[PDB]
Write a protein that binds this ligand. Structure first.
Ligand SMILES: Nc1ncnc2c1ncn2[C@@H]1O[C@H](COP(=O)(O)OP(=O)(O)O)[C@@H](O)[C@H]1O
Ligand code: BEF
Lengths: 89, 89, 89, 77, 486, 87, 89, 90, 88
DNA sequence: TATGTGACACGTGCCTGGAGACTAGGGAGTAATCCCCTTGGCGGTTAAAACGCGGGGGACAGCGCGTACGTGCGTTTAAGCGGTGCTAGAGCTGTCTACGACCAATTGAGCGGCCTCGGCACCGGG
DNA sequence: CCCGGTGCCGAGGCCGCTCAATTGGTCGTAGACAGCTCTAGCACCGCTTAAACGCACGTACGCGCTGTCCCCCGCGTTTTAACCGCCAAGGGGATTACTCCCTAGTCTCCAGGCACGTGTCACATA
């Protein structure tokens, strides 16, 4: 698959299907899904990294929705991206 | 229809012992879907403003630079460049 | 007191009761349209969003009162907060 | 009297969570009015979205879309 | 003999130096043009200035018939000299310089300029800026009969605001005084011809369509058209008392610092590295301290050849004129002169008109020991008379060759017994060669209306031979120096 | 551009009042801004409802969403009358 | 023409062309341009009505950009829609 | 004198900030993000107009905050409070 | 005075915003009295705002593969930031 | 203290998408031109910025107090967890029929350009 | 406050040129509409128990100012930079023709994870 060839865990084919099914444009380049999968993988890795550190500080082995809220608020870059984001818990 | 397996994989990669719950998994999936929708919409608006039918990697890179603030944009464009280079090679 | 502040900040439960908020939501919706039904998830989301907005407004008016060298908040503080925010309607 | 359903201890606890030490008397009525305005706006938007799809009942997705267009993103609903 | 007789018959108000034969022809042509009513342009060279002929014609017009108000527009550094000349040569004629602040201009108009037409109306000599500012306010009321615009190169562009301000004012007759008649193009020539003759030239497309054997026919056709309008009198053609002019372009090799900067490194930065890059690199870095003059002359720029020419001029015992396009290079030269100990006097835009007049008076004075006189290309490069200095050197060469020729011929005036020497500095293997080639093409166009030599460097014997000016009272191509012939 | 139409609708509401050239360009840019907002909202509303064809129902909903409460009630009344007159 | 049948001064054909050229959707209905031109006609007439009254107060026949800026601040509904804009001069 | 000067600047619309220093500041700021950049005059004009409008809005909010604090003279703490309440704290 | 050392360098570009300019800007908003640190505070705020808008405009210009920044890019950046300009 | 519980790792039949290859044609990268506009600086004046002063409006520190808000207890009203029962209404599917798009001609609409004019300038005073 | 003509300068009106709207006509794919399918939201009686309310109070606090004293504002100098005027070039905006390869789909193929029952075990209750 293209995911194993590009060294990315996220599915490149699934994102490519969503871009075409979403009808965002007439044609979609081959370099768009592989480029978009890397950005989504890095952002998801940084969120889970800061959220995992908050769980270790609270002596919690499992990440709870409360830990995700503390991670996006303590980080200035993640707070500006989400803006006014209210977690369920 | 969800990125649960990939989120769990990247979490085990960044934190082997930490295990994410179901609610936090759904929250992370919703966050990833929101980021993907925002990036796709920005790329579509950029392609329509320039009257370009095809969405290339440059559109995704510009959408990432515009949406993501701070060092997040630079890290994301670096990751995307590395991924597209590994895919083309 | 300060102990009551740390207890509510640590907890994440919904402070506003569900039945009065649901009654108020239904009464408000009766004005725009007639014979409408509501899903429990929609009412829960409305309650969560309203509670988050009220917490933000309370933080803002507390900051404004601290700026005015007063520990007790006044309606003029909320008025100034809504005026600076621009949400005054 | 449904607007009066939001009781005084509820507003007091909401202010305690936000960090308010002392609360006045008119704060209750002011917050009730602000909450009424906010709920009116959000419910108007959600009713619009529900009438677009020609549905009788309002779902959580319409409320999420209304909050998103109002600038507040909600996850988990 | 005959020149003294016609001088009294043409203009009796003129009392002083008798006009010569070229001035006789000039005043006769001006009188005939005034009688017929056709406006003309004086294209006399830098030497043999037509300002005396113009003031003689104005005095003749004041002598008989009407005594209407006359307005003269000239650069700032020129109006003082014009007033001095009209006061020295022509007596019993009132002349005021209408240059000052707002309140000063108002009080001068109230005192010396009667609102109604008076018999004794002082001739106003204003600059370009004050005239452009006051054409609508105070100048629109006064009816001006005869106007003289010196240095017609100011009105070269068709879209100058000064052209609009002058068109707003009512002129009965106009006069243009240009050292060089045309620039290396035809649009400005058509604009000048339309400003002086509105009925003759009306559209630029017609003049462009009108202007091997085919190229020889079109130039001969356009020549016969403007011949009655333009009058040209070369210096060497009429005046034989003045010594000949020699323009020698000395080439200096690129220094080590210049080569390193060029290798590290658009056109502006290349030119900055070409001419005096020391202070420019210092200001780009941000250092407050300045390197020594010896370190500068040893490291950067053509200052080595500059100092060679300086010691050659010191041995020859003649005043030198240096021209710099940039205030940075002007300040570099002034600082070098102050560090060496020689007296320095710089004419720049920051210098006021009174200080300019004082400095040019001290320089014309023989007792002054200020042999080094600094002049700008924009200001002071045209309109001033400096006959005490025989040798002139150009550190930089501008794009327009007309300004360079004017700056080189400023010193070459009438009455300069000492032979004039023109020196041009241009580094080889740079954009200076390109800009000199552009200026050469431009001067060739204005006239039509080697590599190894530029690579080599001038030696001490060559410097001595070029300093020796016994031939004016040397091969065409020498090692490190080339002379251009008109 | 809609310059001639802005001038015509101005004479209907104010026959004597005139409009400047700069004011005409601003009014033209204002109409283009509202046109892009209503077209963009209808496109996003079509994607959410999975409907490829846009109609007057989607435009009416986009008007009630973008325009305020008092301003939308008057726009929908005129929009409904134009459709019945056209059909 | 089609614009004369509905009675709208704005061109219904030009709006239909912009919707199809702008590729907002695959198919554009027949009632969409006639409905969209009616909304644009009322909003344009509403702003010119308020701007005309502002010019009438200043005793100026020609409407200047300063008069248009004063009209959007007075009306609440016009300011709610046009609050983020900044009119030049 | 102070009250009359408010009526003059509010009635007449003009570019208060000079064009050349603002242009130099814009070029200096843009030099950090990318080198060898060139700016159009209309772009600089729009930048200046937007900056002046934003500064006028910030000054209005600061004056409101100062009036709320029973002080006629504005202070940097008022500007900080306005920035923090507006949410643009960066 | 012969040395003329020190380029007599001009002040910083951020200092180009003069005190009377900030005073007039505050008067337009309705400020009666202005303090001392207000000038530096507004300088910093204006610098931050200009940095953000210029970064967005430079990104928009890099998207079009153009060297010169145009007015349309500034308008798009300002619209992205939540303030649209009319007449440009 | 301990337990058992829903959260977490796993084969398993699958089941609906990715990739493995021919294609073919219209979007994108690229060689060349032109002249619109931009970067730099010199010249001058001229309104604008800044350095120094006196002082009077104003920010700020402290006090007695007298209005209003925090805290604790018997109590009364409503949130809520459960349970039944009906049902309008949400949601998936074959359809067949009125509705959107290209294309050939068309014929009149407004954008490109020329000319005169007349609301609004400014004039410097009383 | 209005004053005579004055001087602009964008507005009125007209003209020609022509590419944008429109009507007559086929169609094959999007949609409104009868049916049902199984699921959720409507109300309420029954117990009750944590949650809400008002009287008492007494003590931290909001408000007016009293003195101060210092940090701003306005005006006479001047002194330093904008700015309009202007010469000349040249990087780069904007456009056309071209040809090249890559992105959309159809025949197909073989493995990914999605719905579901299961063994177990880290808190989180007790
Ligand atoms: N008629 C004259 N007799 C003597 N000297 C004259 C005469 N006319 C001009 N000059 C000399 O020429 C100079 C003034 O005119 P000049 O500078 O030559 O005019 P232009 O500006 O045309 O070059 C002075 O040196 C003056 O002595
Ligand atoms: F004609 Be100018 F006085 F050199």
């Amino acid at each position: 698959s293209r995911s194993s060839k590009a060294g990315l865990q996220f599915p490149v084919g699934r994102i490519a299907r969503f871009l075409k099914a979403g009808k965002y444009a007439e044609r979609v380049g081959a370099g768009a899904p592989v480029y978009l999968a890397a950005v989504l993988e890095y952002l998801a890795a940084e969120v889970l990294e800061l959220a995992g550190n908050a769980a270790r500080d609270n002596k919690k082995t499992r990440i709870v929705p409360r830990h995700i809220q503390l991670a996006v608020r303590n980080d200035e870059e993640l707070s500006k991206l989400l803006g006014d984001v209210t977690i369920a818990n | 229809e969800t990125y649960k397996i990939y989120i769990f994989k990247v979490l085990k990669q960044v934190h082997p012992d930490i295990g994410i719950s179901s609610k936090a998994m759904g929250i992370m999936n919703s966050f990833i879907n929101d980021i993907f929708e925002k990036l796709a919409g920005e790329s579509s608006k950029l392609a329509r403003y320039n009257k370009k039918p095809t969405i290339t990697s440059r559109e995704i890179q510009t959408a990432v630079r515009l949406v993501l603030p701070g060092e997040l944009a630079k890290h994301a464009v670096s990751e995307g460049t590395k991924a597209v280079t590994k895919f083309t090679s | 007191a300060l102990r009551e502040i740390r207890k509510y900040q640590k907890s994440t439960e919904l402070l506003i009761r569900k039945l009065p908020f649901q009654r108020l939501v239904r009464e408000i919706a009766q004005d725009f349209k007639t014979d409408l039904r509501f899903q429990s998830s929609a009412v829960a989301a409305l309650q969560e969003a309203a509670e988050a907005y009220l917490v933000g407004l309370f933080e803002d008016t507390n900051l404004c009162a601290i700026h005015a060298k007063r520990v007790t908040i006044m309606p003029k503080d909320i008025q100034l907060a809504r005026r600076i925010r621009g949400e005054r309607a | 009297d449904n607007i009066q359903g939001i009781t005084k201890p509820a507003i007091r606890r909401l202010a305690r969570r936000g960090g308010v030490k002392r609360i006045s008397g008119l704060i209750y009525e002011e917050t009730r009015g602000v909450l009424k305005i906010f709920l009116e706006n959000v419910i108007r938007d959600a009713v619009t979205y529900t009438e677009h799809a020609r549905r009788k009942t309002v779902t959580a997705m319409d409320v999420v879309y209304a909050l998103k267009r109002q600038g507040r993103t909600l996850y988990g609903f | 003999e005959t020149v003294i007789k016609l001088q009294n018959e043409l203009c009796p108000l003129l009392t002083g130096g008798q006009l010569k034969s070229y001035q006789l022809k000039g005043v006769k042509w001006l009188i005939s043009l005034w009688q017929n009513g056709l406006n003309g342009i004086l294209a006399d060279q830098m030497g043999l200035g037509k300002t005396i002929q113009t003031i003689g014609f104005l005095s003749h017009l004041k002598g008989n018939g009407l005594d209407g108000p006359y307005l003269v527009i000239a650069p700032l550094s020129t109006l003082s000299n014009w007033f001095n000349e009209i006061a020295r040569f022509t007596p019993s004629i009132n002349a005021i310089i209408y240059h000052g602040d707002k309140n000063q201009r108002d009080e001068l108009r109230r005192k010396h300029m009667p609102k109604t037409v008076g018999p004794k109306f002082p001739i106003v000599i204003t600059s370009y800026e004050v005239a452009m500012n006051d054409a609508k306010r105070i100048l629109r009321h006064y009816p001006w009969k005869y106007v003289v615009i010196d240095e017609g190169h100011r009105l070269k562009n068709h879209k100058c605001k000064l052209l609009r301000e002058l068109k707003h004012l009512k002129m009965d007759n106009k006069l243009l005084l240009t050292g060089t008649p045309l620039q290396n193009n035809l649009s400005e020539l058509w604009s000048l011809l339309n400003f002086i003759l509105p009925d003759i030239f009306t559209s630029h497309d017609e003049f462009e369509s009108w202007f091997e054997k085919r190229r020889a026919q079109v130039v001969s056709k356009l020549h016969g058209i403007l011949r009655p309008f333009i009058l040209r009198r070369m210096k060497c053609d009429v005046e034989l008392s003045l010594p000949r002019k020699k323009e020698i372009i000395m080439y200096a090799t690129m220094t080590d610092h210049q080569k390193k900067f060029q290798e590290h490194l658009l056109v502006i930065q290349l030119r900055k590295n070409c001419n005096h890059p020391d202070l420019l690199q210092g200001q780009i870095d941000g250092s407050y301290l300045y390197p020594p003059v010896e370190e500068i002359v040893g490291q950067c720029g053509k200052f080595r050849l500059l100092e060679r020419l300086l010691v050659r001029l010191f041995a020859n015992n003649h005043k030198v004129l240096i021209f710099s396009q940039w205030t940075k290079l002007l300040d570099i030269m002034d600082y070098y002169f102050s560090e060496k100990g020689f007296e320095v006097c710089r004419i720049d835009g920051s210098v006021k008109l009174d200080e300019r007049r004082r400095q040019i008076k001290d320089f014309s004075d023989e007792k002054s020991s200020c042999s080094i006189f600094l002049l700008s290309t924009r200001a002071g490069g045209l309109g001033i008379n400096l006959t005490a200095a025989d040798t002139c050197i150009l550190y930089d060469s501008d794009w327009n060759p007309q300004m360079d020729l004017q700056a080189m011929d400023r010193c070459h005036r009438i009455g300069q017994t000492k032979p004039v020497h023109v020196y041009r500095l241009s580094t080889a293997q740079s954009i200076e060669t390109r800009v000199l080639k552009r200026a050469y093409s431009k001067l060739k166009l204005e006239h039509v209306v080697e590599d190894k030599l530029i690579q080599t460097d001038i030696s001490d014997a060559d410097l001595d031979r070029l300093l020796d000016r016994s031939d004016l009272t040397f091969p065409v191509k020498g090692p490190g120096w080339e002379v251009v012939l008109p």
